Design a protein around this nucleic acid. Structure first.
Lengths: 286, 375, 230
RNA sequence: AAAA
RNA sequence: AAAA
């Protein structure tokens, strides 16, 4: 049984022999991570393993545990039951596992570079998870699994003017120019949240400054959507001052994740999950 | 010649080393270093660990055992290869990878590892352990580090610049005294970089690096070594190819204007203009944005033209006007902020206002004044 | 042709030593036998003697500039004196007084080494050859304080002057323009303001009111720090 | 404009 | 705008 170890030191340059050689010789070691029934967690993790094997046929979950110690639970943002609408539960969920999972897992694989492979379940929480991850992570965001966000600076392109918008249509509506706050309805999911969010802003927040961005071909790359979204945001933040932004958005988990990656914690941003509660605030992410 | 090991003496292929037990002829030492020597000694030391000091004076204290292949196996004791040692004693410029960070030490270690890999891309002989062994700069000294988020107090920012930044480059350049410094710089907080570059000055050769997050590899976006083009203001407005500069004068009597730079993605123009017109009572402005690709500047290409045209616009705004005070509000790449602080320096009455994400309104605050940093 | 590298600095002593070492290397690649230990050995001129030095920042009071020029600078270039001077200084305006009282170098920062680039009757003499336009500031100071309306502006490649050749054409053109203006119109008092490299300022001095711009000073930023005819 |  |  002492063969592979010697074989290992015969393949270091710094089931199958190719798997061991690429485990000891690659640099961009993948890590598939799911945000989440535990049986369904196992099924989704197996699907993620297959998807990351499509590009890295030498990578395996058991091999990952043997080589780096990262178990499937370490890659799992787990917790039983449906998510309560209370903000304390979401804040504690981010603080417990999601806050330092990336730091710990990158600390485990110290010499090699990292290519994350992220999948998720809940939409409005993907912004918090992406803000935790940040724009500085070489990450493939997947969606059978299909990788839809290839980020391995184009994700943060705001050059696209309102005239040459290929995918989305933006409509910034300002009724109180002296009030520095903005509603940020983003309509890219399934149901139309425009009326409910408008009523909520005009009733429970007294906001009449709202941003409306508005099912999607999963085969293509998903970067121009994020580019035009950020462009609309920063064209709105051009001749006016805003001190609070509130998301009321429906969209694929992948795109919300990438939007949390891009916009991040810089803007004063409180996402209100809809089943309408500030489960987290982006400026309070760090 | 004298070499110290935990000492040896080297005289001008027979590298005969004398010893109390038995004199031996390590001919491969002479072969590795291309000089025949008669190694001296003062006391009997067990173990053949005196090889590395001999070989280093041939080519501070050293420890290790040489091999005929040139690989070194076991104060400098963390080296492995002969070429690393060769280019560690015989180079002209010592890379000094400086990273500014605010957070936890684990991400600091990761950031420094990435910056070390970038330096090794151009200087394969470099490494952090070898740097700390060869000259004593640890990872913390190259780190402009403070735990957690900086409080949004201008006193805290000025203090952080004082205790660490104001003397960091001076002390590090004093440490590597005989050799020039090729400063490899990256930072974290963009507004801090204006102060870091103003204290850095235009008198230091620097590779200011930005990371391509697609590969988690830094890129030499400001190459100011091998720097006068750093301070080129010969560019005219009609000859602008990278930046887009506007100059609004609504109160010519007042000698005050707001300098706003938008070369990142998160637009600061509205917030900064509101801050100037509502808290500083300023109507004159110098607004710089990108020409074509706003929010993305190609990290592969040289970023020097951006700063060239920015500085040309800044000094063209000063052609027929006198400005008692300039107010700087920027979103921009970390490296670009550092380069702009390097070029502009302390010569203008510029108060730089940082935008804090986790702060109540107003989120701008004059954390420092560019002319007041030398005080 | 004995080396004599004189450098003006105002700040900490360690940065002064760093600047001195760079200047020593610049002499060494032209005179290999020279060194600072050599300078303190054969001649005894120690590194502070060749340094026009002042701790901290020079205060923005005229008495300070006159004290600096008379106590050290006036006797510096005279008493320290075959010999050839390599000069490069910190303050651009102080070189005007220094020159008025040879290889004049300017530092190229990419490789971090110098390069020998030199081998009403009231008017505002104006020079803009650096990268910080003083035209507006000096013009406003003239109009509001000294009541000046006539100017002589000296100004190609602006902000980059090729520090691998001779800058003598620049100084010769400036001298020709100044002499032409003097022939055309008599100037009892010509007021000089400049943003320029320290090397060209020293050369211009080597070739009558002078004002200086201080970064950490309150308005007015310009004052008549000395007269070139005193 | 305080090594332009 | 806290590795843009």
């Amino acid at each position: 049984s002492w063969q592979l170890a010697v074989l290992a030191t015969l393949l270091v340059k710094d089931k199958k022999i190719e798997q061991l050689d690429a485990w000891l010789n690659t640099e961009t070691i993948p890590l598939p991570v799911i945000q989440y029934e535990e049986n369904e967690l196992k099924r989704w993790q197996k699907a993620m393993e297959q998807k990351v094997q499509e590009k890295f046929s030498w990578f395996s979950y058991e091999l990952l545990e043997d080589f780096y110690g990262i178990t499937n639970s370490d890659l799992a943002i787990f917790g039983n039951g449906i998510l309560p609408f209370e903000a304390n539960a979401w804040q504690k969920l981010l603080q417990e596992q999601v806050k330092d999972k990336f730091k710990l897992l990158e600390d485990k694989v110290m010499p090699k570079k990292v290519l994350w492979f992220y999948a998720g379940q809940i939409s409005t929480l993907q912004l918090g998870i992406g803000a935790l991850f940040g724009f500085k992570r070489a990450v493939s965001i997947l969606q059978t699994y299909h990788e839809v966000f290839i980020l391995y600076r184009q994700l943060k392109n705001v050059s696209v003017k309102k005239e040459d918008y290929q995918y989305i249509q933006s409509e910034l509506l300002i009724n109180e120019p002296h009030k520095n706050e903005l509603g940020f309805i983003i309509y890219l999911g399934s149901h139309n949240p425009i009326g409910e969010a408008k009523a909520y802003c005009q009733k429970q927040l007294q906001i009449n400054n709202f941003l409306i961005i508005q099912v999607m071909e999963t085969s293509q790359n998903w970067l121009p959507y994020l580019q035009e979204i950020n462009s609309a945001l920063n064209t709105a933040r051009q001749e006016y001052h805003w001190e609070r932004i509130h998301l009321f958005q429906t969209a694929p988990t992948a795109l919300c994740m990438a939007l949390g990656i891009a916009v991040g914690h810089f803007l004063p941003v409180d996402v209100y999950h809809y089943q309408y509660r500030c489960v987290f605030s982006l400026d309070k992410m760090l | 010649k004298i070499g110290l090991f935990p000492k040896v003496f080297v005289y001008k292929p027979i590298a005969l080393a004398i010893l109390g037990d038995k004199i031996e002829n390590f001919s491969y030492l002479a072969q590795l270093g291309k000089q025949n020597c008669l190694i001296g000694f003062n006391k009997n030391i067990q173990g053949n660990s005196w090889q590395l000091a001999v070989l280093a004076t041939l080519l501070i204290a050293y420890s290790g055992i040489v091999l005929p292949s040139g690989e070194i196996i076991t104060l400098v004791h963390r080296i492995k290869k002969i070429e690393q040692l060769d280019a560690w004693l015989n180079t002209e410029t010592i890379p000094l990878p400086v990273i500014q960070y605010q957070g936890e030490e684990n991400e600091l270690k990761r950031w420094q590892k990435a910056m070390e890999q970038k330096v090794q891309e151009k200087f394969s002989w470099f490494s952090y352990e070898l740097l700390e062994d060869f000259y004593g700069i640890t990872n913390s000294d190259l780190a402009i580090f403070g735990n957690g988020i900086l409080p949004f107090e201008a006193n805290a920012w000025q203090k952080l610049l004082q205790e660490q930044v104001k003397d960091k480059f001076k002390l590090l350049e004093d440490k590597v005294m005989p050799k020039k410094v090729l400063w490899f710089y990256a930072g974290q907080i963009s507004t801090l970089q204006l102060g870091i570059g103003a204290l850095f000055g235009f008198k230091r050769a620097v590779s200011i690096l930005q990371m391509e997050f697609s590969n988690t590899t830094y890129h030499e976006v400001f190459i100011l070594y091998g720097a006068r083009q750093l301070k080129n203001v010969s560019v005219k407005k009609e000859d602008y190819q990278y930046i887009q500069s506007e100059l609004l004068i609504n109160e010519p009597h007042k000698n005050e204007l707001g300098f706003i730079i938008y070369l990142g993605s998160h637009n600061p123009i509205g917030e900064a203009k509101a801050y100037c017109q509502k808290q500083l009572q300023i109507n004159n402005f110098l607004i710089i944005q990108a020409r074509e690709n706003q929010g993305v500047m190609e990290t592969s290409q040289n970023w020097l033209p951006y700063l060239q045209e920015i500085n040309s616009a800044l000094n063209t705004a000063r052609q027929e006007y006198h400005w008692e005070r300039i107010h700087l509000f920027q979103t921009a790449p970390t490296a670009l902020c550092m380069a702009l602080g390097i070029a502009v320096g302390h010569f203008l009455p510029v108060d730089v206002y940082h935008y804090q994400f986790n702060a109540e309104e107003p989120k701008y605050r004059c954390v420092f004044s560019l002319d007041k940093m030398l005080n």
